[PDB]
Coordinates of C-alpha atoms and ligand atoms in Angstrom, one line a residue:
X350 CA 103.5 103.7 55.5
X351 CA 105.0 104.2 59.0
X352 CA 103.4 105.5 62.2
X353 CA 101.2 107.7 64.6
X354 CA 100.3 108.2 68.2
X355 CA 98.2 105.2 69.3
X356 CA 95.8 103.1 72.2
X357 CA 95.9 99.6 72.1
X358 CA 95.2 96.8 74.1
X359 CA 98.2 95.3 75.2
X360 CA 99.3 91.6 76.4
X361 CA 102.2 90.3 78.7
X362 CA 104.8 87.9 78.5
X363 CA 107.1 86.8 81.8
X364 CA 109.7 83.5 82.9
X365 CA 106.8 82.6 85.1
X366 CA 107.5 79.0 86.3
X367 CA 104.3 77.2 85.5
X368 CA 105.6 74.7 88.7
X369 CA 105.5 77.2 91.5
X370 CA 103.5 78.2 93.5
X371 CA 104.3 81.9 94.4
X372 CA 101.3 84.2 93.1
X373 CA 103.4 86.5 90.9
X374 CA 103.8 83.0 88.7
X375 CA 100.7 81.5 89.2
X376 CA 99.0 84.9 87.6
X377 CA 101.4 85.6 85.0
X378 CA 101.7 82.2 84.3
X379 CA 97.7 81.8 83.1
X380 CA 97.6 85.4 82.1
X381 CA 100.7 86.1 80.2
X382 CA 102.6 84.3 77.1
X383 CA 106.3 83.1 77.4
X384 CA 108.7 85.8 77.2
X385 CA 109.7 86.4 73.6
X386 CA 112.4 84.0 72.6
X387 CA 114.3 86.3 69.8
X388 CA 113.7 89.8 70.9
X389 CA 115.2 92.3 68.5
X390 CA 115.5 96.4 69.2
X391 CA 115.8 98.5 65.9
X392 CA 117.6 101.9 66.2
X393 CA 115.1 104.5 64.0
X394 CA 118.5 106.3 61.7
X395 CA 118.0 110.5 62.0
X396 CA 114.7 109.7 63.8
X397 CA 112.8 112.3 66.6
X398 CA 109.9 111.1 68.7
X399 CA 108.3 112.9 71.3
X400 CA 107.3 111.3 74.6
X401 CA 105.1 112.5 77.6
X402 CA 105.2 109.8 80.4
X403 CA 102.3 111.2 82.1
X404 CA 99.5 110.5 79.8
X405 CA 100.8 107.2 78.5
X406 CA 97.7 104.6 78.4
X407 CA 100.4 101.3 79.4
X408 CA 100.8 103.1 83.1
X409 CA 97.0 102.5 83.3
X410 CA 97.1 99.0 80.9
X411 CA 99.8 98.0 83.8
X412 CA 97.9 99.1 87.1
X413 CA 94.3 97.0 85.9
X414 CA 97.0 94.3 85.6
X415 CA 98.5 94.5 89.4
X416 CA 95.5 95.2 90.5
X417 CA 94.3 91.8 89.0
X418 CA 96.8 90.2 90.5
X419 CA 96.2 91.0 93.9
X420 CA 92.7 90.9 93.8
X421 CA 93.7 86.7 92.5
X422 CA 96.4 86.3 94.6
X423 CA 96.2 87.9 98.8
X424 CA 93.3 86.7 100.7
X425 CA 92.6 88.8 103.7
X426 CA 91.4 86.9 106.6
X427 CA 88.4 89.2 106.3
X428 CA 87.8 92.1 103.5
X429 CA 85.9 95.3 104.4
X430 CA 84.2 96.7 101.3
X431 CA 81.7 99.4 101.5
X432 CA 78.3 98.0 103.4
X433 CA 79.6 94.7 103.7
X434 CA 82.1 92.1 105.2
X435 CA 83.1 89.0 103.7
X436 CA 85.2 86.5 105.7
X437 CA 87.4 84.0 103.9
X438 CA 90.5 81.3 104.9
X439 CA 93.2 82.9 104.8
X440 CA 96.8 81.1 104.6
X441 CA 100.0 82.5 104.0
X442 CA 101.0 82.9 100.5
X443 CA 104.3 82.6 98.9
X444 CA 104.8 86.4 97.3
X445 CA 107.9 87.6 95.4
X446 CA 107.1 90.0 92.2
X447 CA 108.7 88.3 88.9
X448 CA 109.6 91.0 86.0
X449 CA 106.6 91.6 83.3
X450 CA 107.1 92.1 79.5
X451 CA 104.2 94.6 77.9
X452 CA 103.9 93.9 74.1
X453 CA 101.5 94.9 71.2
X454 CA 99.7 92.8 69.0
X455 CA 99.6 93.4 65.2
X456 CA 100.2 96.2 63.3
X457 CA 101.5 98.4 66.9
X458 CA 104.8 99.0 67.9
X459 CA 106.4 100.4 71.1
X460 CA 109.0 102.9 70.8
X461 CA 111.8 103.5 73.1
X462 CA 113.7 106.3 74.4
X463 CA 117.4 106.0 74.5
X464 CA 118.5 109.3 75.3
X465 CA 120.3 108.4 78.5
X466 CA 119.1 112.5 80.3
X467 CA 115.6 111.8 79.0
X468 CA 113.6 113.7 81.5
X469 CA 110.3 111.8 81.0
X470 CA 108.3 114.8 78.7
X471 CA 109.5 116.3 75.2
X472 CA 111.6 115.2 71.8
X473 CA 113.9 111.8 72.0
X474 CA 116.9 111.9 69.5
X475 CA 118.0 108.2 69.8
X476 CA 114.5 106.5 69.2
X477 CA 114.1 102.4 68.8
X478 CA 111.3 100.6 68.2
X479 CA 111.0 97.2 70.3
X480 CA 107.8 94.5 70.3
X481 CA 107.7 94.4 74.3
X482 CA 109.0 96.4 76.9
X483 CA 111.8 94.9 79.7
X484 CA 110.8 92.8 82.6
X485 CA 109.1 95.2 84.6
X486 CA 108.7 94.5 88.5
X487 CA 105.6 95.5 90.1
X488 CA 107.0 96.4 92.9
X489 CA 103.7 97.8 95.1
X490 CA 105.6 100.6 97.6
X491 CA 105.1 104.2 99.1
X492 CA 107.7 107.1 99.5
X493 CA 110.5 104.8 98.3
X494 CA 110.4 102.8 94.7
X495 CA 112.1 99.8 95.1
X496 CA 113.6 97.0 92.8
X497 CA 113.5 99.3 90.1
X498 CA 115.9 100.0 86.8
X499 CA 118.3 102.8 87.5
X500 CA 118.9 106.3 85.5
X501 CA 122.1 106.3 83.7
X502 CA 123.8 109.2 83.7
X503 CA 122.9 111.8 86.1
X504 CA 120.2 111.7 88.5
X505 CA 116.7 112.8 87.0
X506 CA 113.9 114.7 88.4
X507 CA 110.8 113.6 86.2
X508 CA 107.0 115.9 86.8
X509 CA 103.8 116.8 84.9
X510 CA 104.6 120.0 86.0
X511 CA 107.7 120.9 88.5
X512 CA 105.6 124.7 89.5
X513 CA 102.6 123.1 90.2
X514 CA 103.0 122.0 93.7
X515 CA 100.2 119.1 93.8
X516 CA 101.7 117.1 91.1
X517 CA 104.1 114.1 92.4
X518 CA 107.9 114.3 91.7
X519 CA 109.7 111.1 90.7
X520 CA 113.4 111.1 91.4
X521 CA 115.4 108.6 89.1
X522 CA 118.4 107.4 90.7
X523 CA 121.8 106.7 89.2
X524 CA 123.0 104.6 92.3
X525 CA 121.2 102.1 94.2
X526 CA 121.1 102.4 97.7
X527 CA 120.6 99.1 99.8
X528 CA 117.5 99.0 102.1
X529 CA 117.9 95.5 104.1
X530 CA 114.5 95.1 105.8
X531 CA 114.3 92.1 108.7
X532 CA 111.7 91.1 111.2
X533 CA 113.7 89.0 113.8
X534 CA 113.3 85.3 115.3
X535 CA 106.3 91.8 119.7
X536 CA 106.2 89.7 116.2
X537 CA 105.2 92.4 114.1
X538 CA 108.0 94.9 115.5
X539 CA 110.9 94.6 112.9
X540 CA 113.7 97.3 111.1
X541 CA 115.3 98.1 108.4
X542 CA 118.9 98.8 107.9
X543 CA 120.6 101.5 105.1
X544 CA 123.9 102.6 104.7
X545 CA 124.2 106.1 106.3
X546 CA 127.0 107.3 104.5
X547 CA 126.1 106.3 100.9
X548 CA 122.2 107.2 101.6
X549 CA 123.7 110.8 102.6
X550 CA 125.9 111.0 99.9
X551 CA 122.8 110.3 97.1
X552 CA 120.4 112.4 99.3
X553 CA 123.0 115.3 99.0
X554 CA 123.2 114.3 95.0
X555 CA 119.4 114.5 95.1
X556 CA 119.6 118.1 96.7
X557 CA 122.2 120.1 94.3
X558 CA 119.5 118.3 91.1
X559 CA 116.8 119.8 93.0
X560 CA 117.9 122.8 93.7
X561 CA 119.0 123.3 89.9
X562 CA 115.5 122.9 89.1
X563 CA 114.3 126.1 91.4
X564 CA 116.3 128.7 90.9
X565 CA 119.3 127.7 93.3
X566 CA 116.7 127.8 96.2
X567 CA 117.7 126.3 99.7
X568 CA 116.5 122.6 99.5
X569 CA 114.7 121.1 102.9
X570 CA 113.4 117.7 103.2
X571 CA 110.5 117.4 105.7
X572 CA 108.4 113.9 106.9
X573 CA 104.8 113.6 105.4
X574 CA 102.6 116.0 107.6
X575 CA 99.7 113.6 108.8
X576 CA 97.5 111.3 106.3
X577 CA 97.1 107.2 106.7
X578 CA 100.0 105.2 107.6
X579 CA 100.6 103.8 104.6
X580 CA 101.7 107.5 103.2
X581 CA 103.6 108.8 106.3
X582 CA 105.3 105.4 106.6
X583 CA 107.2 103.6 104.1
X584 CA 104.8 100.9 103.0
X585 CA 106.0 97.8 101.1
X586 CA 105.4 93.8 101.4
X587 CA 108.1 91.2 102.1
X588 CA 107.2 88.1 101.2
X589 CA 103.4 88.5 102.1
X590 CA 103.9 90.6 104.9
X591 CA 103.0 94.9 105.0
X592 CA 106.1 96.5 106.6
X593 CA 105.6 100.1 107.6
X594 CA 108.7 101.7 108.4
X595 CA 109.6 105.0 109.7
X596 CA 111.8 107.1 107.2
X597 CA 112.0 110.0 109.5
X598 CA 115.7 109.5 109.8
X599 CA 116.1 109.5 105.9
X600 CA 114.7 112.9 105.7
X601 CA 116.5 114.7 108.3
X602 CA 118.3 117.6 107.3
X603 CA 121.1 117.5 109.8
X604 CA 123.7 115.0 107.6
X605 CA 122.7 116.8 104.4
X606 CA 127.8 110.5 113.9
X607 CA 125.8 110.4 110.6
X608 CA 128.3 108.0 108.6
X609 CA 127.0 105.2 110.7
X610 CA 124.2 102.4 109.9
X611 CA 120.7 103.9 109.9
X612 CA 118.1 101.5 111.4
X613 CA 114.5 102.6 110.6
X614 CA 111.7 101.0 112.8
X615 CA 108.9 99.2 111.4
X616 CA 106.2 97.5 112.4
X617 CA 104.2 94.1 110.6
X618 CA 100.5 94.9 110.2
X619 CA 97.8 92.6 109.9
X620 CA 95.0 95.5 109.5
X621 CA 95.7 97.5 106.2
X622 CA 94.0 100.4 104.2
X623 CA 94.8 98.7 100.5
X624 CA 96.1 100.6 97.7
X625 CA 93.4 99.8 95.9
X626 CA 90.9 102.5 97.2
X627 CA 88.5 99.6 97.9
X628 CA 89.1 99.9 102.0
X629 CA 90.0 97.7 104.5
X630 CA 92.0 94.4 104.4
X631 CA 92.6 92.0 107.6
X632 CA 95.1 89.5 107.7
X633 CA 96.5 86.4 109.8
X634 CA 99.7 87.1 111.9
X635 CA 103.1 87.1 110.1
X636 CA 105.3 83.5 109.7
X637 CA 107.4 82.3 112.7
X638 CA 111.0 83.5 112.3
X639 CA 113.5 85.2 110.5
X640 CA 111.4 87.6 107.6
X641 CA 114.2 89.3 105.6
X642 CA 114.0 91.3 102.3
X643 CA 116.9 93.2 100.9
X644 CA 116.0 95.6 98.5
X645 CA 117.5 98.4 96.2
X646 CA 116.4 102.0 96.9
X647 CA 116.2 103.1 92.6
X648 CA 113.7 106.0 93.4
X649 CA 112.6 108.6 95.4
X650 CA 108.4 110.0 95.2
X651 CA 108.2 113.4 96.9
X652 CA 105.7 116.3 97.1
X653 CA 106.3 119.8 97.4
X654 CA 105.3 122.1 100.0
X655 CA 103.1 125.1 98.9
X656 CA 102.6 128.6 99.8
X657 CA 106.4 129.4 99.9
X658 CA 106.4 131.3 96.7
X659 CA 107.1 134.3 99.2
X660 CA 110.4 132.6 101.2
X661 CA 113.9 131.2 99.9
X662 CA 113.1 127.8 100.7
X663 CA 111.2 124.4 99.3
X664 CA 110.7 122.0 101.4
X665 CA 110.1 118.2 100.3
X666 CA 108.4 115.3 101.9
X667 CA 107.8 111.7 101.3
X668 CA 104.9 110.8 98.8
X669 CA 103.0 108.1 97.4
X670 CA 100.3 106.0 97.4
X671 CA 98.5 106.3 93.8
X672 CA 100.4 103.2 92.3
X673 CA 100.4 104.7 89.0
X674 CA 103.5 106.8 89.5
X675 CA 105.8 103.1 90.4
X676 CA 104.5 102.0 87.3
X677 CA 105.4 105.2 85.5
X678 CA 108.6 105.3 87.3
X679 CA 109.7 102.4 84.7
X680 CA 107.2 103.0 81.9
X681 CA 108.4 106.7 80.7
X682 CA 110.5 106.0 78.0
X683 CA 108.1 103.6 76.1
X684 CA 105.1 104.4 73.8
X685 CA 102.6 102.3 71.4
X686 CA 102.3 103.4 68.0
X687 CA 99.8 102.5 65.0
X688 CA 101.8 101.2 61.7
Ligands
MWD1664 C1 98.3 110.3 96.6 C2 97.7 108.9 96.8 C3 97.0 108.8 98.1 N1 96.9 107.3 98.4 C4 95.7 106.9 99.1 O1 94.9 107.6 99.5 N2 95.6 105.4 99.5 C5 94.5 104.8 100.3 C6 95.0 104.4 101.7 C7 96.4 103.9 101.6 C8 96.7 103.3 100.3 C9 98.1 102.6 100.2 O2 99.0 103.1 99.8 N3 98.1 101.2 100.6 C10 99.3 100.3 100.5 C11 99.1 98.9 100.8 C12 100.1 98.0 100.7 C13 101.3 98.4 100.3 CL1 102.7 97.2 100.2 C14 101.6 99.7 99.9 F1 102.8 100.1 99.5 C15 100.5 100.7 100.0 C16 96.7 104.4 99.2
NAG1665 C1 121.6 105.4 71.2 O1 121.2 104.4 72.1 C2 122.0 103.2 71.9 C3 121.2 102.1 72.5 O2 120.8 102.3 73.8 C4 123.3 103.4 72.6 O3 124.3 102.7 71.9 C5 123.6 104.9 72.7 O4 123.1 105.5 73.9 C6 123.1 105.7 71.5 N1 123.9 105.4 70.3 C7 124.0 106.3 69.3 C8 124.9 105.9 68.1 O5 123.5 107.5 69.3
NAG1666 C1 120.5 96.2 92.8 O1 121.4 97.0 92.0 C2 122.5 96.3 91.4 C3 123.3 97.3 90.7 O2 123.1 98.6 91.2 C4 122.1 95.2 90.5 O3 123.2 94.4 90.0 C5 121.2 94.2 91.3 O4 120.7 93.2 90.5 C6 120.0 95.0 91.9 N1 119.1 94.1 92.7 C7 117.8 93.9 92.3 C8 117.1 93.0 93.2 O5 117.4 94.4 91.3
NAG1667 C1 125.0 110.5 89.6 O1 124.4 111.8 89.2 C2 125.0 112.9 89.7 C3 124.3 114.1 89.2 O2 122.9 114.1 89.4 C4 126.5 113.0 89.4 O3 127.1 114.1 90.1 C5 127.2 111.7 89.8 O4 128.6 111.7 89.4 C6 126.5 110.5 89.2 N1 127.1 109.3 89.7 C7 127.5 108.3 88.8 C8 128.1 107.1 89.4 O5 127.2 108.3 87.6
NAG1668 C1 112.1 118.2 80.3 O1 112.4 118.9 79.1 C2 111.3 119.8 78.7 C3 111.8 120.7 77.7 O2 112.8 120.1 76.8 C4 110.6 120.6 79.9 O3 109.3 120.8 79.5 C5 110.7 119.9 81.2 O4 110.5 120.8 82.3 C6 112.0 119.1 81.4 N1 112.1 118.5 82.7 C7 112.8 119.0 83.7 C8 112.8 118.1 85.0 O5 113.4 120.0 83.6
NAG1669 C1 101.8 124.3 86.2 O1 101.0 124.6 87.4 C2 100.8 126.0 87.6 C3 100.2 126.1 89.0 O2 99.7 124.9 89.5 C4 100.0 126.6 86.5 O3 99.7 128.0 86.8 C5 100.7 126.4 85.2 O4 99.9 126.8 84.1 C6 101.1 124.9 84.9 N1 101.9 124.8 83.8 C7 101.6 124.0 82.7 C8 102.6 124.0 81.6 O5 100.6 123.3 82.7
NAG1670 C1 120.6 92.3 106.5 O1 120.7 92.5 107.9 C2 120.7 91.3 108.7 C3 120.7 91.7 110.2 O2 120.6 93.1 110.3 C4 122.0 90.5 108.3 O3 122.0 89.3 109.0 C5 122.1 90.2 106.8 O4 123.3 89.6 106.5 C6 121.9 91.6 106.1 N1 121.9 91.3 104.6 C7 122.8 91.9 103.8 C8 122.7 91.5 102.4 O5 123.7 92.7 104.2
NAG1671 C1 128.6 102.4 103.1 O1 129.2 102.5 101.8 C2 130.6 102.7 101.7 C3 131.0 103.0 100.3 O2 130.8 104.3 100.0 C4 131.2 101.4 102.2 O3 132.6 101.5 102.1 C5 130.8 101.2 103.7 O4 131.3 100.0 104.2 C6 129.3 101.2 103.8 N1 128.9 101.2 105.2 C7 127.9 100.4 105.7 C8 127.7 100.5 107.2 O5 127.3 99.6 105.0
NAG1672 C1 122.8 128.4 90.4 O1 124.0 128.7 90.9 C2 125.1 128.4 90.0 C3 126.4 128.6 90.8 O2 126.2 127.9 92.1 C4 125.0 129.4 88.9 O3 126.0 129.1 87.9 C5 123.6 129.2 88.2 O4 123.4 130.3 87.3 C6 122.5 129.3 89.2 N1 121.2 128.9 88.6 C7 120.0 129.4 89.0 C8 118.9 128.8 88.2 O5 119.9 130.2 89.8
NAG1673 C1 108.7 108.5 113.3 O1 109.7 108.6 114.3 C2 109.7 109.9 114.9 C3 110.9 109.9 115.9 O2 112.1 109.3 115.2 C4 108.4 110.2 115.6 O3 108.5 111.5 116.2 C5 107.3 110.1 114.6 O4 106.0 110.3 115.3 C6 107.3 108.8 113.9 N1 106.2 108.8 112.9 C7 105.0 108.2 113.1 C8 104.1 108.2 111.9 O5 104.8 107.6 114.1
NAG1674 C1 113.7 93.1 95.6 O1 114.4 92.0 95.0 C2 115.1 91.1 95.9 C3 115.8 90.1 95.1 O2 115.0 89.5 94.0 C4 114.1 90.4 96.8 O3 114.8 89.6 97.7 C5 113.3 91.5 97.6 O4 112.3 90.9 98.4 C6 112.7 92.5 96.6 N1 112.0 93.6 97.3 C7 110.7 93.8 97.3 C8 110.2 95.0 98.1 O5 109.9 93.1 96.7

């Protein structure tokens, strides 16, 4: 009397402090339950499972969640949606993304994934069954995936389909890398600072995986060619405030003096296009002095050049921008089933 492939309505569960007054804990804190205080993971003995992370209904479950949350929590100065306007106050907000448990109600389990080189589709030989996920950070972000858990063995490239071209790659790290983003006491110009060496060192590690995944083909890298800013920039928020950086020195092919610092330009902006496909967002200037947000680089979202079926090359850029892929990025090796 065991189990099968199932949908179900999930709930959450979070160390939201019901004192503050950041938005990650307000929401969480009227919207989710305490986080469970006697969790227990049972290994599955001689047990397969197959997985497929890309049509897994908690990546959608999550994103009607964040997009709650924001929709509660930010409040542009004014909002433009569709034929209308609507103007609003709008103070600064305290803003810092706590981590998020996903559980099942009764008679649903999740099952978990534990083979460590578990590319995201296909069988899993070390299965356990758990009640909720691990704090999960909804970590809003373009081209990088920040804040993020980190693969465990070698690095993983995870796609629907790595031949089709449109589909978006998600590279799983196995080494942070440091991205140490600070707007100084212009107000919105500000910059963020990486380790050259180390980020060189992982980008290489990111080529060889790459190119063993198309036929020993010569791997490029290549910024986004044209779109909105928040795709061909770096796009993330530090404590309330959208940072668009420049990555163009990340995805340089040259250090694939480049053992150095790299300091990436970005600039604070109040006018947004928001990731919710609803439009256009204004908000107030950013807060006087020092804004500072060190973060760790855990993945990489990149999409694939077409039409060089013909050459010896692939050449890689920068993606982003559906928010279903960061949530993905953490979700893949987790499943609800019916018992
Ligand atoms: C393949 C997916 C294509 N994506 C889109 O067409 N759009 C609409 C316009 C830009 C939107 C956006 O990413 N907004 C954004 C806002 C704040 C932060 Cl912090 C952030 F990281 C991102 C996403
Ligand atoms: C299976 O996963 C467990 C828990 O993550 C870990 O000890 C190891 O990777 C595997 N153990 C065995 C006995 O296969
Ligand atoms: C960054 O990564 C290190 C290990 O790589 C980890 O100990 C640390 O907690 C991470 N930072 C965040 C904010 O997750
Ligand atoms: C990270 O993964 C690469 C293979 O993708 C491997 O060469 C490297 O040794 C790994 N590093 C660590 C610290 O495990
Ligand atoms: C993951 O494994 C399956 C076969 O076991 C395959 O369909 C898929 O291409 C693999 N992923 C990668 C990145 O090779
Ligand atoms: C992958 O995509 C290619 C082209 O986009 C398509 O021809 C092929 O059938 C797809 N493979 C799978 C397994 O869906
Ligand atoms: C981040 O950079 C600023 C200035 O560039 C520096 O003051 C700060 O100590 C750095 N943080 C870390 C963790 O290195
Ligand atoms: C970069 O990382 C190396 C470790 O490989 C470290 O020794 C070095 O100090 C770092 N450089 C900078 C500028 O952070
Ligand atoms: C890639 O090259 C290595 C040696 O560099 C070789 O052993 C392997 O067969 C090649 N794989 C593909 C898919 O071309
Ligand atoms: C990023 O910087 C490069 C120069 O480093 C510049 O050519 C490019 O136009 C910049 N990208 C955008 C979107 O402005
Ligand atoms: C990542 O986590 C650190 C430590 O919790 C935090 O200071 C930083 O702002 C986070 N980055 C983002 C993009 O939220």
């Amino acid at each position: 009397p065991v189990w099968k492939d199932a949908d179900t309505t999930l709930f959450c569960a979070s160390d939201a402090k019901a004192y503050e007054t950041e938005v990650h804990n307000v929401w969480a804190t009227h919207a989710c339950v305490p986080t469970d205080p006697n969790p227990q993971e049972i290994h599955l003995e001689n047990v397969t499972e197959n997985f497929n992370m890309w049509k897994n209904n908690m990546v959608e479950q999550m994103h009607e969640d964040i997009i709650s949350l924001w929709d509660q929590s930010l409040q542009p100065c004014v909002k433009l949606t569709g034929g209308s306007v609507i103007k609003q106050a709008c103070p600064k907000i305290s803003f810092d993304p706590i981590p998020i448990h996903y559980c099942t109600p009764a008679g649903y389990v999740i099952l978990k994934c534990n083979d460590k080189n578990f590319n995201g589709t296909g069988p899993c030989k070390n299965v356990s069954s758990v009640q909720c996920t691990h704090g999960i950070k909804p970590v809003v972000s373009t081209q990088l995936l920040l804040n993020g858990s980190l693969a465990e063995e070698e690095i993983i490239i995870r796609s629907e389909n790595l031949t089709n071209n449109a589909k978006t790659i998600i590279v799983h790290l196995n080494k942070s890398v440091e991205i140490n983003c600070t707007r100084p006491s212009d107000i919105r110009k500000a910059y963020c600072e990486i380790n050259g060496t180390k980020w060189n060192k992982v980008l290489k590690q990111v080529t060889e995986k790459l190119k063993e995944h198309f036929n020993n083909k010569t791997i490029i890298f290549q910024p986004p060619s044209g779109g909105d800013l928040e795709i061909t920039m770096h796009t993330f928020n530090c404590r309330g405030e959208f940072f668009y950086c420049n990555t163009t020195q990340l995805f340089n092919n040259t250090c694939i003096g480049c053992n150095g610092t790299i300091t990436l330009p970005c600039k604070i902006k109040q006018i947004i296009n928001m990731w919710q496909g609803t439009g256009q967002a204004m908000y107030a200037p950013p807060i006087d002095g020092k804004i500072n947000c060190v973060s760790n680089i855990t993945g990489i979202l990149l999409t694939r050049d077409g039409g060089a079926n013909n050459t010896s090359n692939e050449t890689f850029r920068p993606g982003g921008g559906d928010m279903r892929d960061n949530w993905r990025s953490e979700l893949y090796k987790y499943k609800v089933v019916q018992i």
